[PDB]
């Protein structure tokens, strides 16, 4: 079963959240942070056919980039993984599904208590200029009636009152206020326009980022405030 | 003052053996202690060469077991 | 041949390199007795 180049790109994006997975049959892959807080899901053009655990999925994708694309990939006789060229026959050791944790399911994300979307250059801009200003956390909150993305230095300011960078996707008509706080390390997502869903219930809360290749549901931090 | 040339130190460290004549191991350990050299910050002082003959003469002198011979 | 450590080393060398000649030195265990009596307050000394 072939792993397409777009398949390899999404496998790259998922191997970031985890250097391994338990591949499960379907046209879909998904993985969880080791903490399970920020999660990745993606219905992929390739259809998984044999459920197989892999430990170094990043290195597995390296191995993939070491062999030609249309090599037939199967689960080998001893249970391991066979990459088959016209000549090359390679057995990558198939992992144990308990050495690598998998997410329970694709997160049935709740309804968004607020909606916006972040442009490609928007997310690129925030996440990359965070290096110049040393931004370590983000505050998405109602500001001037807008869903603003304030890059806060939670090391230098745990209160998130000293902005060095903000991002304003668009104004959000609302009286019910909030100041969602989410780790800059929760931003496992690749660049690109990501529809931002801000679900807010009590203290449970999430930002669902719906990109061009995967949905990542991010559990809001305990400091994310929301008020309806 | 500063002596950061590795291969020049190779020229100097062959002087040890070729002159004194005990072995490359003891000659260069003598060098290491003469100029007071530890064993983890050496790659900045020692030529990349002498290391290889050191390995060679070591395994030939059997410093370690058959566990190291095969590899 | 018994105690002169410096001495016996010098000997061993000179013999294994063809020179029969002796350096007298001065015994060692004697010094042991010297310090051993220096233990008790009986100050002992070795005049000029």
């Amino acid at each position: 079963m072939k792993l397409s180049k777009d398949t390899t790109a999404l496998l790259k994006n998922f191997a970031t959240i985890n250097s391994g997975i338990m591949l499960k049959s379907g046209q879909f892959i998904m993985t969880r942070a080791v903490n399970g807080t920020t999660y990745a899901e993606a219905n992929i053009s390739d259809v998984i056919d044999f459920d197989v655990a892999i430990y170094d999925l990043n290195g597995f994708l390296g191995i993939l980039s070491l062999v030609n694309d249309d090599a037939e990939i199967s689960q080998s006789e001893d249970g391991n993984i066979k990459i088959a060229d016209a000549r090359s026959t390679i057995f990558w050791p198939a992992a144990d599904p308990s050495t690598v944790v998998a997410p329970n399911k694709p997160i049935p994300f709740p309804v968004a208590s607020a909606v916006t979307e972040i442009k490609a250059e928007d997310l690129q801009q925030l996440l990359r200029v965070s290096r110049g200003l040393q931004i370590d956390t983000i505050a998405i909150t109602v500001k001037e009636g807008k869903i603003v993305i304030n890059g806060f230095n939670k090391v230098e300011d745990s209160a998130l009152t000293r902005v060095k960078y903000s991002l304003t996707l668009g104004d959000y008509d609302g009286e019910n206020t909030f100041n969602f706080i989410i780790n800059m390390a929760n931003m496992k997502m690749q660049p690109g326009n990501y529809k931002l869903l801000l679900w807010a219930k009590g203290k449970q809360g999430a930002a669902k980022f719906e990109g061009e290749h995967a949905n990542y549901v991010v559990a809001l931090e305990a400091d994310s405030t929301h008020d309806f | 003052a500063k002596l950061l040339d590795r291969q020049e130190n190779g020229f100097i460290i062959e002087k040890m053996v070729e002159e004194f004549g005990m072995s490359y191991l003891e000659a260069t350990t003598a060098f290491l202690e003469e100029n007071s050299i530890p064993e983890t910050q050496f790659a900045k002082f020692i030529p990349s060469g002498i290391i290889e003959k050191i390995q060679s003469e070591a395994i030939d002198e059997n410093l370690l077991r058959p566990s190291v011979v095969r590899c | 041949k018994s105690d002169d450590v410096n001495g016996r080393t010098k000997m061993y060398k000179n013999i294994v390199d063809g020179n029969h000649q002796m350096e007298p030195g001065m015994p060692e265990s004697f010094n042991v007795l010297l310090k051993e009596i220096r233990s008790l307050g009986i100050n002992i000394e070795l005049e000029d």
Binding site: - | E33, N35, S36 | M26, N31, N43, I44, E47
Partner: protein, 86 residues
């Protein structure tokens, strides 16, 4: 070399004049490091180096660093031969 041997007594002054220090701690060894104690019946702090030319500072390796005492060890730096007799 030297002429006649003499005997005499010693005012406790001269005893002080001899010793390279004074011992108070009654014990000797750490039983884990098997090293001398800090101020004990075998301690280097008076008697000296258990190896030669270097002590638990690890600070002084060659003749360039010999001699001068440590501060971590506190002990002078020299050969262990002199420990036999101090």
């Amino acid at each position: 070399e030297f002429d006649a041997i003499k005997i005499a007594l010693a005012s406790p002054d001269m005893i002080r004049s001899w010793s390279f220090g004074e011992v108070k701690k009654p014990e000797t060894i750490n039983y884990r490091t098997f090293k001398p104690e800090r101020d004990g019946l075998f301690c280097a702090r008076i008697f000296g180096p258990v190896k030669d030319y270097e002590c638990l500072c690890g600070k002084y390796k060659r003749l360039k660093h010999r001699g001068v005492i440590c501060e971590k060890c506190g002990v002078e730096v020299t050969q262990t031969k002199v420990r036999r007799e101090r």
